[PDB]
Amino acid sequence: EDAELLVTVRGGRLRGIRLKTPGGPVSAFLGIPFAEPPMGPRRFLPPEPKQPWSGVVDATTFQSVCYQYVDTLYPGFEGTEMWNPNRELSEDCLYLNVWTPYPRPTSPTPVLVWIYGGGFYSGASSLDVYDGRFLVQAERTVLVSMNYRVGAFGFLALPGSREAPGNVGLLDQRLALQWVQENVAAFGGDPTSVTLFGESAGAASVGMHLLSPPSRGLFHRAVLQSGAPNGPWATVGMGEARRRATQLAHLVGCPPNDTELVACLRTRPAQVLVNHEWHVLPQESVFRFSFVPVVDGDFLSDTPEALINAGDFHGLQVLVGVVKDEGSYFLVYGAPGFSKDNESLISRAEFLAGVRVGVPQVSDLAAEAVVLHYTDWLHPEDPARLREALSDVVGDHNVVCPVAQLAGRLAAQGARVYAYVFEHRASTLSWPLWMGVPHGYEIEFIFGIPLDPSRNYTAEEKIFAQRLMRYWANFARTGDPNEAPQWPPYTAGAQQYVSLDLRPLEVRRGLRAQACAFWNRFLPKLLSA
Amino acid sequence: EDAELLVTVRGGRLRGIRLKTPGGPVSAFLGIPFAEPPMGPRRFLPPEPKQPWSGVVDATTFQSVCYQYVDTLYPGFEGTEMWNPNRELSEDCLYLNVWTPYPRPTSPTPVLVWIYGGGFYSGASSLDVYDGRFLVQAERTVLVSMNYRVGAFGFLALPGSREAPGNVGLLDQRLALQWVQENVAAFGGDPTSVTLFGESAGAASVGMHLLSPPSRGLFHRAVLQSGAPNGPWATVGMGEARRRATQLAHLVGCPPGGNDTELVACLRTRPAQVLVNHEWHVLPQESVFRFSFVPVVDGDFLSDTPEALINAGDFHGLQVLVGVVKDEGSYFLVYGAPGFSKDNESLISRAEFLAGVRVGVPQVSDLAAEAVVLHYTDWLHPEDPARLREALSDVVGDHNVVCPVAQLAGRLAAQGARVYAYVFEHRASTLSWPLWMGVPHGYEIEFIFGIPLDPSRNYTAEEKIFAQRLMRYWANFARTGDPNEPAPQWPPYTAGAQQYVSLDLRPLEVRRGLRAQACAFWNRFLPKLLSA
């Protein structure tokens, strides 16, 4: 009966749902099919556009979560289950979601497209912390998010083969972006103003769409939160991709011919691949994931590092940033002596052991270089500083310094870059205090979750959330987050960024400039000579 | 005749002189021969002990400076002329000096033995800054200093050969130490309480005597000022020692390699100055803080490298006093680093800094130089001229002095020796070097020898108090192995706490770590890099 909730897209008709916010209603269209279900013979294959349907597709609830591992480290703990699937798992998972103002915009409205993270092995557009109703209400944007295949289903690759070409999870994302170009106007969105934003592997995904020409024509601005395509975890070579796919087949009961092997893997229930996918990693590590985008000359014609250094980025505006303590979250999943249920006051021996799990597949000389830069040789063995130091090792090597490299190259090659460090610890944060501001805990403020009255955020946290939503939407609208004091662009020389917390904007210089000189300037030379 | 200035040593009778000092008289025996003159057939050979003499030998003035290069970069400039020869140059130079109180002490008195520095190519015991009269009058010590051969004459080596075995300049020092054991009691000195102290190459020499068993038995305490035997400039391997000796002989026409005795015999016929004029052409690169002829690790005087010996040594029963000046590196930058001069501010560019790293850290791989650039670059101010200037000074000083000294002090502390460490931080009011150089290499010496008490100088009243405090520290260490007053306390240096004291006009301040973060790079990481 509500025509505001009826939409006709290119494939057929949809019925949405009215959602309530403390500031009024918005229109949501959830579980829109954008691809043919990648099942049976379609497993590992690139996505196919959803064939047209008759009747009205019910778009009132989130659809299934793409098949993935479920974290079991702290069962029932808020800090971990908030990232676990909150819908049924299925390979029938290529659906996207649209939120618009209510009533629907009658003038073209800028579009934000969210790509979730989760190390390319997990994630879902349906998690509570990605709820788009508050952003859409407060800043009057059209917000789209899609599910994409993760783990082996999205990124297992036997390069050169047709049965498992790899990067199909990235092609899922691109297909959704194509869907947005063709259909977002039916919801009031403006296809000529599309801003990608993502976090962790989602930020790495955004960066890879920047570096892939078939994707570059489908959006106009980019936001990379706590992730970059040049991360040591975000891509894998062809030879290593083939090794992991081949080992997974072996652990699963399949041969050894690429054709016959993928055929046998197609016979296995999805849960069987999930349970063995972590046993193909070459060693004990943290912040490493089995099946990630592969550099094979197709989706990425070269390594992300090479494409970054060679790129002309005039006309590009980008928003990048990190949280205060990028590494702490990962240390509880493998670094000896760490746990959320203690102070994690590790010994020096545990620190040296943790450096090898935190910087895996490097020579001992490279590891010794790491322990040299991150040791205070006036307090070689103080547990508190050792714990803080290993957090810096994992955080700088995996997030901060890859992001700093990307920002510097883009700025020096024509792009307008804005950088931030998110330094507010949520009053509701369930992780212990020694983790500070962990990986991923700026998301809830950017989506305005503090506005939800059924949660215990403070009044200043609600104000803080509204300011962050204004920054992000300002950037989506104009390529500039400013409306104070002012947020200056990041440059390769001045290296200016702002701290995001409850205090007014504070401008600082250098994203861990000393530490990132080690990772980005020296250690590459050490590894190749 | 005065009975006070007549002494009989094992070789014959000596006549000395009574020196005036502001505090009072001291007895000086200057220019006592302890070796047969190492000239003619005795060039490059180990020193032979002085054969006994009849009559009285007048030890009344300093003897010749051992033949050596004369510095020419700033002619007439006081800051450089103070290190140049102040006596005639000669190969007949193996003489030592003994200062003793007046009247001579009734009971055996501890003995300080000075070994001058100068990169093993220069120096002399006659320099004004090594005048022992003020120390001996202030603290009633016996002070001995000796000349030793430098340059090719002291350290040219064709290892395995007998005509030029190498390290003969160290054996001159050893023979002087043997002379002290046999004769210092005749001047009132105690041969069971002998403290070696030296600066720069002299400090490196002191360290090598610690590491050489035939020398270790001739002294009991050591003081190493701004130098260490494990410094990258203080030794060479046998093969590079021979390469340089052969290259030197080739450039002066010898022979017209080959047999070693024939080549050395040809070298013995060359005028001493012609060897000096060519000894710098054998250096393998453009560098600073590298010297052509230095001690050689040949398995004799040094059974292994100083590092290996320091690590494998048991140092119980030994007390050591080590230290550095505040700006160890600046003095060397004006002798070859691009963009540096004493006459301007030396505010170098980024390119000059990178070029300076290669001359301050020579013979390292390109990757090794990259590691140096990474550690000493401030990546928030990568091109600030003043920062680059101080950074290159840090590079040269850390690599050559501070970190070698810190590696030595830490190992000996952890292996049974009682160590005391200092950083000398006072800039003399009379210093002639420009202000950007800070407290340069070697400018604590004049305060340790009490030169500010000289009537003819112009030090402030404070600097004379400061000199008297430092002389007391050194003599307290010589007497008891402990610089502290038997007043702010000076704690041992240990591998863990790494405590040292600052020496300036202020009272003693305790600090931790001798450039700990920097020296971790030089002493722990970079060796691993050069291996792989």
Ligand SMILES: *[C@@H]1O[C@H](CO[C@@H]2O[C@@H](C)[C@@H](O)[C@@H](O)[C@@H]2O)[C@@H](O[C@@H]2O[C@H](CO)[C@@H](O)[C@H](O)[C@H]2NC(C)=O)[C@H](O)[C@H]1NC(C)=O
């Ligand atoms: C600072 O001076 C150095 C050295 O130049 C010397 O000192 C000058 C004051 C003047 O007396 C010169 O005659 C001296 O040679 C400069 O570096 C030299 O610059 C000259 C001229 O460009 C060049 O030919 C030499 O090769 C340079 N030598 C070195 C060691 O770099 C330096 O450029 C001056 N920097 C300033 C002006 O701040």
Ligand SMILES: NC(=O)c1cc[n+](COC[n+]2ccccc2/C=N/O)cc1
């Ligand atoms: N499919 C699996 O068996 C599996 C096992 C472990 N993990 C990783 O879960 C731990 N974890 C959870 C959250 C964030 C990071 C990490 C680990 N990083 O190295 C994924 C899949």
Ligand SMILES: NC(=O)c1cc[n+](COC[n+]2ccccc2/C=N/O)cc1
């Ligand atoms: N025999 C020579 O020609 C000669 C030339 C130069 N030097 C060294 O003089 C320069 N210098 C003088 C004082 C202190 C350091 C330095 C340089 N060190 O690399 C010695 C001998």
Ligand SMILES: *[C@@H]1O[C@H](CO)[C@@H](O)[C@H](O)[C@H]1NC(C)=O
């Ligand atoms: C915090 O919020 C939770 C639900 O999110 C609620 O159960 C709890 O009572 C709240 N605590 C307060 C308001 O102190």
Ligand SMILES: *[C@@H]1O[C@H](CO)[C@@H](O)[C@H](O)[C@H]1NC(C)=O
């Ligand atoms: C070198 O020459 C001398 C003199 O001719 C000769 O006695 C000796 O055997 C030769 N070999 C050596 C030892 O260098």
